[PDB]
Design a protein around this ligand. Structure first.
Ligand SMILES: *[C@@H](C)[C@H]1/C(=C/c2[nH]c(/C=C3N=C(/C=C4\NC(=O)C(CC)=C4C)C(C)=C\3CCC(=O)O)c(CCC(=O)O)c2C)NC(=O)[C@@H]1C
Ligand SMILES: *[C@@H](C)[C@H]1/C(=C/c2[nH]c(/C=C3N=C(/C=C4\NC(=O)C(CC)=C4C)C(C)=C\3CCC(=O)O)c(CCC(=O)O)c2C)NC(=O)[C@@H]1C
Ligand SMILES: *[C@H](C)[C@H]1/C(=C/c2[nH]c(/C=C3N=C(/C=C4\NC(=O)C(CC)=C4C)C(C)=C\3CCC(=O)O)c(CCC(=O)O)c2C)NC(=O)[C@@H]1C
Ligand SMILES: *[C@H](C)[C@H]1/C(=C/c2[nH]c(/C=C3N=C(/C=C4\NC(=O)C(CC)=C4C)C(C)=C\3CCC(=O)O)c(CCC(=O)O)c2C)NC(=O)[C@@H]1C
Ligand SMILES: *[C@H](C)[C@H]1/C(=C/c2[nH]c(/C=C3N=C(/C=C4\NC(=O)C(CC)=C4C)C(C)=C\3CCC(=O)O)c(CCC(=O)O)c2C)NC(=O)[C@@H]1C
Ligand SMILES: *[C@H](C)[C@H]1/C(=C/c2[nH]c(/C=C3N=C(/C=C4\NC(=O)C(CC)=C4C)C(C)=C\3CCC(=O)O)c(CCC(=O)O)c2C)NC(=O)[C@@H]1C
Ligand SMILES: *[C@H](C)[C@H]1/C(=C/c2[nH]c(/C=C3N=C(/C=C4\NC(=O)C(CC)=C4C)C(C)=C\3CCC(=O)O)c(CCC(=O)O)c2C)NC(=O)[C@@H]1C
Ligand SMILES: *[C@H](C)[C@H]1/C(=C/c2[nH]c(/C=C3N=C(/C=C4\NC(=O)C(CC)=C4C)C(C)=C\3CCC(=O)O)c(CCC(=O)O)c2C)NC(=O)[C@@H]1C
Ligand SMILES: *[C@H](C)[C@H]1/C(=C/c2[nH]c(/C=C3N=C(/C=C4\NC(=O)C(CC)=C4C)C(C)=C\3CCC(=O)O)c(CCC(=O)O)c2C)NC(=O)[C@@H]1C
Ligand SMILES: *[C@H](C)[C@H]1/C(=C/c2[nH]c(/C=C3N=C(/C=C4\NC(=O)C(CC)=C4C)C(C)=C\3CCC(=O)O)c(CCC(=O)O)c2C)NC(=O)[C@@H]1C
Lengths: 348, 160, 50, 67, 161, 161, 160, 161, 161, 160
């Protein structure tokens, strides 16, 4: 109607109130019976797109109006003007430093990313270099490493993910069982550890021809660590075909960090470090740099399978904001219901 | 055994034996008399269950005994019944020991690539152990059939 | 409120203004109607789908 | 690629870990050649004593074909 | 590892036979001993820390190790020794409930002697500490399960020394 | 948008110099090709329904796209695909007569990928439709004018892929 | 294909294409005409290989079409020949591509879980593919069949 | 990602049919065009750093971008811009070898516009940088290979814009 | 990994000289034998599973090794021995293709004799299995190709024995 | 070598050799005669290539031969020529191996910080290898000069 985008937060507020009060006819009538419409198009002139060269363009809805004047505007279903006008006043959101699309879904398996082209919902925000993202720890809230950096090795008992270690003895470690020993009990523990390490590297269980049996029997013999086994599983060509090659490079770096540390990246420092490693040397170097980082050695030893330690607030909201699994006292006043005093007096 | 499984679980949790699992061991010791009498009944009647479970398997799935199949022939039928008797012995070991882990490590780990190399139909083996479960439930009392059916169904679930 | 110099609006691909005068002939009347349909529906729906 | 068969002991300095820690305290291992520098520096800034190290695979003075 | 029941299953599997009469008599003997094993394990699990304290009081306190220059002087090393005695007592309880020392063979004594030689831990002093542990447990639970407890504790002594 | 003339003048203006040695060659090649490009535009604009007819008949008809379950099943979707092929032919004519693909960059390829990924239009089937367009135009206008249209049609195909 | 595999490897090492991989792409480009001839003969005769290899499979393994078998029945044998035609089309795709990654992506990843859910003997499907390569080797010239049998060989190695 | 061969194979597999005559013709076209692509990849792999060097000297040195306050002022910003040019040139070489721009969608253009918008990177300046990359590459690599590299780098520019 | 070609290059590099005729003759011998190596590798890969299955069936099945009381009784030990034999076949095929047994010395013969001596793996039974594999491959791939395969096969047999 | 790279790729993927790389080994093992013809041509004519390339490098970039440069004096220019001899020897090793892994394992890894420490401009080293490539391609046959220059300009690209 007006040939332009919404211009201000108060304008979006007023016209949203109009379209909420009276719907589409009230919105259309309020648009056409305005000073701006009668000023620009009068009574007989067809409205026209008031783009870059038609008039002076204001420096507040630039990218939103630029995306709106394209013919692909009715395929962005996320409202772009009100979100940017609110986030202008508000501080930086819970978002990856390279964009909203760079954040994977916090699910068990699958590097599911928002797509820039399919249903456009890109939400850029100017994150500078030393801008740490606030992450929510899975375990105790005291054991967050932001304020408790010595609690990196603490295990999340009953609050976070299950921790898999080589606490049990591997079979064939010593020659105390001098052959035979047909009911040697400890092998299902290390087989379970191998399956859990496979699940952590590739979030869902593999198929028959995909397992690295040489690395499996090397860990069962004790030749390599759990750290080296995780390194070899991530350096395997299946990880390259599944999560590195079909994705954007920083998306793959972020998903690799979330799988190999149980933690999203803090921001531009770690992201630029692993991006520079990926450009200079490559995917294998990114894998070994993430494994040989000091934070990996602090969180997990040479025997500990990685586990999901931190979440994004959006991922925690997806997990615990559904109808089930949401507590009664999260965002609701809880009234202490009681048997009424007259019923109490009526009880003999 | 479940005493070894409790030791393994307590060592994994880095603690002593819980009173609940100690009472579990106590109940295991008290029920050990029936838990061994089921093993003795299966050992005593171990032949006919193998034979008629194999015959019921063969009329259910006659493709394996048909020519061109894995179990065709006198020798192949004999070693099929030999493997069935072996798995019956494993079930007796499991129902005396009280835990499914010795079965899982003596006959049931590597069985997929074992029978993949052998060409043996793993679904037909699962059907054979299913018919063994039916024959054992017919041959024993209802509660004893129920307690043996946990180990039998463990074997079925790990087969397929 | 804003300002724009009168050199920027002399090279920047001016919009064609369609005004429905009452006396207009059939060709430019249908052109104005089609331009109005393109403005409201971002495309020529009476050509694409009648 | 050429591999290093190493054996080292790393002690705990910060916490008294109540779980079984002998397997990651004392261990014999196989580390790659390109990762051996960073692995040795990691355990050696951690503070362990390495008792033994050999070339499990490969030969010294290999100009080509060591990979 | 293997307990008495899985050792019986091992003896059955090596000969490839079913459970004969002697194996079932062994299982009934283990079922008979299981009551005393469970009661003794409950006693040790209830009194785990006190056994360590009376053993370290009768063995290691007021000695050259807890004097400076010894291996007990740092309180980190003291807490490490208390945790080591907790490990030895817990695995001794595990072996007492299992009826076999294969747990001690596979887990504790896999590299304990050589890592103590690497770290400078006095093997004679921890042998006397284990002996003190054995005497305290034998006094606590009586001689009945205390003979099996002493068998597993001096098995730990023979493996470590 | 911009054309070849604007690209030449912009490059020379960024340099700050005149049209010295190769800008003149590009401009004279453009003006030499121009009258035949206008003739090809006349032929395509005159026959424009026939090109999309033979293109849909050659490539997309009698297929899974047109049968139920396909993206060209309903009549609205079919007419939209006809209008899209008309858009591709007309903007290819625009880029062919401008001598630059900036019109395709700013009015076609700016949102074509995102509208097709949001709608669910098959990219490969659209590419095959544009290939049928470019061989039909090559048959109907000529080999040289067919290639001059087909370089921009392949630019649109590369923008699709 | 081999081009995609070389590009993926070069991206993994974050480098441009090595001249060895450039030579392998060059040689594949020069020698692709023989692969196109092989694929043209296979798609021209594609019912004949499935016909003869299905006949030879039903001769060598009649337990498949015996009652109780996986492919017992008219529709089940039709689905058997449908799977044979699928694998023949995949072999033509692999011959054209010059590398076996399209075959691996379409019909060799998860094939074990698929046929385990379907109850189908994977070694018998491998026997059917081997008989398809026998019929194709009989149908084609010697060097062309020797080059085209290696994709069948990779299918045999993955399935059996 | 996919090349032209895998694009034909995937289209035929989605259709559920074998390779027909037009598929064979497209494959023969790619096999005809393969040798020039291989020698072009060899030339670009030879001159990988130098193309970036003369392109950035052609477009971005001694300008407002490298002047103080511009987005290439600091050394880390210069290194990141050179890194981005190396990424664009290598992935354009990959797309030239594959004969398809699918790898540019999968690896490069999937989120790079939002990445640059969050970073504050001038996409106009990057577009001029990639035009300089086009010019320097077409200077060294030939004519038809220059056209292919120009098509894929203009696809990168269209994804940026 | 050291092959014939890398052995020639390293034997040149140890004195720093170029390639003489003496290093040229063995390289020409490798180039002459490479076609037979590729043919033998193709046949071995064609029948990789069936060679192992047939040699296992007629070499050690229904014997005391797979009987209860034997090392290969348990299904886990059976699958381990099948994996070991498949590894020997595949790595001996690698050595046959490479023209040297350095891949066997570097990947298979690295701490395996002590592992088998610790685990009680029967050396004589593995020798019989290797000889069965060697004679089956010699019957299948040909006389000279089978003998050249058996050179690496009895080399790794003597190394493990 | 190319066979070494194929072996380590098959071992890393834990599989037998793929059809594509088997065909590459076959075609390389046929073309090894032409590769050794290139090798014997380069070894026979090695001295004039490096002499002309060093002279052309010296006239192209005189700051090396200038005072204050990296090679000031006859012994340091002889050291530069010896380095060019080493690079030509590595190119011959590459064309006999069929793969660039000998040039990686002798003269490519660490070469940037090597010449950083030495003060030698590695871009001028790349220019020297360009001069070596163009003089060699002018000297010997063009159809073989393309095969030699692929390894030459891979060395140039890794230098730059
Ligand atoms: C008798 C009805 C007349 C006749 C028909 C005729 N139709 C076609 C071709 C097509 N018609 C359609 C139409 C639809 N498909 C849909 O899904 C719907 C909505 C439910 C409609 C309306 C389509 C898609 C085709 C193309 C075939 C295809 O599936 O791809 C033809 C063929 C013309 C040609 O050139 O091929 C004919 C002959 N023609 C008459 O004269 C009768 C009046
Ligand atoms: C044949 C071409 C394929 C096909 C196409 C198809 N297109 C649409 C609808 C739209 N196409 C566009 C694209 C543009 N609009 C523009 O203004 C321009 C530049 C001038 C372009 C490129 C848009 C915006 C739409 C949606 C609204 C519209 O009709 O304009 C559809 C319909 C989608 C629906 O479900 O309604 C279809 C089906 N589909 C195929 O399968 C052929 C490969
Ligand atoms: C002058 C200091 C520098 C400079 C300026 C320059 N600006 C433009 C064009 C635009 N400037 C704006 C900015 C605003 N719009 C607003 O509404 C406000 C706040 C009230 C601001 C700050 C916009 C939107 C444009 C584009 C259209 C317009 O003019 O409104 C240009 C023209 C670019 C062109 O050639 O099209 C220039 C040159 N450039 C310099 O080099 C000086 C450093
Ligand atoms: C089966 C009923 C239908 C169907 C299935 C189908 N699924 C996939 C692949 C994936 N599915 C998931 C979903 C999950 N992520 C989770 O975290 C959980 C719960 C723990 C689930 C269920 C994901 C992430 C994938 C991606 C692959 C992966 O495993 O990571 C596919 C494959 C699609 C592809 O392109 O690979 C299919 C086909 N589709 C049907 O038609 C059936 C009706
Ligand atoms: C206290 C004033 C009120 C309150 C607090 C409350 N906070 C949490 C938990 C978290 N708080 C943070 C916040 C930060 N992380 C950072 O890195 C920074 C900047 C340095 C901040 C400010 C986070 C991330 C958490 C999650 C736990 C974690 O540490 O990762 C809780 C717990 C929520 C729960 O369900 O357990 C609470 C309750 N709530 C009140 O009512 C007080 C008024
Ligand atoms: C019968 C239910 C099915 C069947 C049987 C069949 N079995 C064999 C031969 C063997 N099976 C095994 C496996 C085992 N090893 C163990 O330790 C145990 C018990 C824990 C089992 C079950 C082994 C080792 C053999 C070989 C015998 C030997 O001692 O060497 C065959 C013969 C295979 C052949 O090629 O000759 C057959 C046919 N086949 C079926 O179709 C029934 C479903
Ligand atoms: C106490 C009886 C005597 C002794 C103690 C002492 N212990 C340590 C440190 C360690 N002890 C172990 C032992 C184990 N780890 C395991 O996982 C198990 C089995 C469950 C055992 C038995 C280990 C590994 C250490 C190393 C450090 C660690 O905590 O992992 C020390 C040394 C502490 C230090 O390094 O500073 C000492 C001194 N010494 C005595 O004199 C007592 C008699
Ligand atoms: C002089 C001591 C040496 C020398 C210098 C030299 N530098 C350039 C070109 C550039 N140098 C920079 C570096 C910086 N820009 C910054 O803003 C900062 C930090 C404040 C640094 C370190 C840049 C960006 C350029 C590009 C020019 C531009 O600003 O756009 C050259 C020119 C090379 C050319 O090709 O033009 C030279 C000659 N060279 C020497 O040999 C001396 C040792
Ligand atoms: C160079 C042409 C111009 C330009 C570049 C520039 N970019 C950055 C920073 C980043 N660019 C990226 C983009 C990518 N992500 C990917 O996955 C890929 C390959 C597919 C690319 C190319 C990213 C992630 C960053 C962030 C890296 C970081 O965090 O440091 C900068 C740096 C800005 C800064 O450090 O603040 C620059 C300068 N900008 C220009 O002005 C040149 C014209
Ligand atoms: C088979 C011919 C005979 C035999 C074999 C047998 N092997 C194992 C188990 C293992 N063997 C190895 C050794 C290797 N690692 C490698 O990477 C390679 C190839 C380069 C080899 C050969 C390993 C690691 C194991 C697993 C050790 C484990 O037990 O965890 C066994 C099992 C021993 C056991 O106690 O389970 C057997 C029986 N012995 C025979 O009798 C067959 C005739």
């Amino acid at each position: 109607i007006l040939g332009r985008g919404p211009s201000s937060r108060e304008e979006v507020q007023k016209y949203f109130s109009i379209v909420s009060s009276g719907g589409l006819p009230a919105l259309v009538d309020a648009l056409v019976d305005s000073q701006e419409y009668a000023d620009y198009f009068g009574e007989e002139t067809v409205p026209y797109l008031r783009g870059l060269g038609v008039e002076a363009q204001e420096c507040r809805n630039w990218g939103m109006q630029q995306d709106l004047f394209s013919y692909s505007a009715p395929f962005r279903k996320v409202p772009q003007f009100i979100t940017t006008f609110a986030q202008y006043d508000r501080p930086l959101p819970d978002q990856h430093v390279y964009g909203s699309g760079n954040d994977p879904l916090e699910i068990q398996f699958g590097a599911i990313f928002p797509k820039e082209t399919r249903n456009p919902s890109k939400r850029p925000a100017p994150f500078n270099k030393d801008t740490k993202r606030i992450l929510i720890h899975r375990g105790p809230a005291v054991n967050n490493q932001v304020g408790n950096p010595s609690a990196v090795g603490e295990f999340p008992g009953s609050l976070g993910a299950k921790v898999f270690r080589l606490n049990g003895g591997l079979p064939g470690a010593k020659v105390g069982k001098n052959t035979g020993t047909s009911v040697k009990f400890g092998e299902s523990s290390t087989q379970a550890l191998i399956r859990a390490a496979y699940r952590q590297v590739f979030g869902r269980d593999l198929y028959e021809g995909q397992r690295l049996s040489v690395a499996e029997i090397q860990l069962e013999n004790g030749d390599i660590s759990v750290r080296e086994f995780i390194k070899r599983l991530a350096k395997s060509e299946l990880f390259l075909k599944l999560y590195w090659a079909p994705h954007y490079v920083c998306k793959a770096i972020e998903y690799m960090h979330r799988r190999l540390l149980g933690r999203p990246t803090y921001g531009r420092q770690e992201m630029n470090q692993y991006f520079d490693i990926a450009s200079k040397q490559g995917f294998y170097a990114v894998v070994e740099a993430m494994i040989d980082s000091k934070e990996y050695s602090d969180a997990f030893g040479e025997d500990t399978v990685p586990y999901e330690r931190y979440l994004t607030p959006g991922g925690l909201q997806m997990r615990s904001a559904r109808v089930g699994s949401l507590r009664e006292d999260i965002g609701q006043r809880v009234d202490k219901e009681v048997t009424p005093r007259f019923v109490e007096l009526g009880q003999v | 055994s479940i005493v070894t499984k409790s030791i393994v679980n307590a060592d994994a949790e880095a603690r002593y034996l819980s009173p609940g699992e100690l009472d579990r061991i106590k109940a295991f010791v008290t029920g050990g008399a029936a838990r061994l009498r089921i093993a003795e009944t299966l050992t005593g009647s171990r032949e006919t269950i193998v034979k008629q479970a194999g015959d019921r398997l063969f009329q259910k799935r006659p493709d394996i005994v048909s020519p061109g199949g894995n179990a065709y022939g006198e020798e192949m039928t004999a070693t099929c019944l030999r493997d069935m008797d072996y798995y019956l012995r494993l079930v007796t070991y499991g129902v005396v020991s009280g835990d499914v882990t010795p079965i899982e490590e003596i006959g049931l780990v590597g069985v997929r690539e074992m029978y993949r190399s052998l060409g043996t139909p793993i679904e037909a083996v699962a059907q054979s152990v299913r018919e063994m479960k039916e024959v054992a439930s017919g041959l024993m009392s209802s509660d004893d059939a129920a307690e043996a059916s946990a180990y039998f169904d463990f074997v079925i679930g790990k087969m397929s | 409120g804003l300002e724009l110099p009168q050199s920027y609006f002399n090279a920047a691909a001016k919009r064609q203004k369609y005004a429905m005068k009452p006396g207009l002939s059939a060709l430019e009347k249908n052109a104005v109607i089609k331009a109005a349909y393109r403005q409201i529906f971002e495309r020529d729906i009476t050509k694409a789908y009648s | 690629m050429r591999m290093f068969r190493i054996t080292a002991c790393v002690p705990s300095q910060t916490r008294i870990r109540t779980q079984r820690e002998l397997q990651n305290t004392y261990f014999t291992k196989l580390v790659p050649y390109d990762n051996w520098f960073r692995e040795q520096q990691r355990i050696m800034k951690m503070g362990g004593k390495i008792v033994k190290v050999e070339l499990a695979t490969g030969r010294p003075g290999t100009n080509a074909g060591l990979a | 590892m293997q307990d008495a029941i899985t050792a019986v299953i091992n003896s059955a599997d090596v000969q490839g036979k079913y459970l004969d009469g002697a194996a079932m008599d062994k299982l009934k003997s283990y079922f008979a001993s299981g009551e005393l094993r469970v009661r003794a394990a409950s006693v040790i699990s209830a009194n785990a820390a006190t056994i360590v304290k009376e053993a370290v009081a009768k063995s290691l306190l007021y000695s050259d190790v807890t004097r400076p220059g010894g291996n007990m002087y740092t309180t980190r090393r003291y807490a490490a020794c208390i945790r080591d005695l907790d490990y030895y007592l817990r695995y001794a309880t595990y072996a007492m409930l299992a009826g076999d020392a294969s747990i001690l063979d596979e887990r504790v004594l896999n590299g304990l002697k050589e890592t103590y030689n690497s770290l400078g831990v006095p093997i004679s002093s921890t042998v006397q500490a284990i002996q003190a542990i054995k005497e305290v447990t034998a006094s606590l639970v009586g001689a009945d399960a205390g003979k099996e407890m002493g068998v597993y504790l001096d098995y730990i002594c023979s493996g470590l020394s």
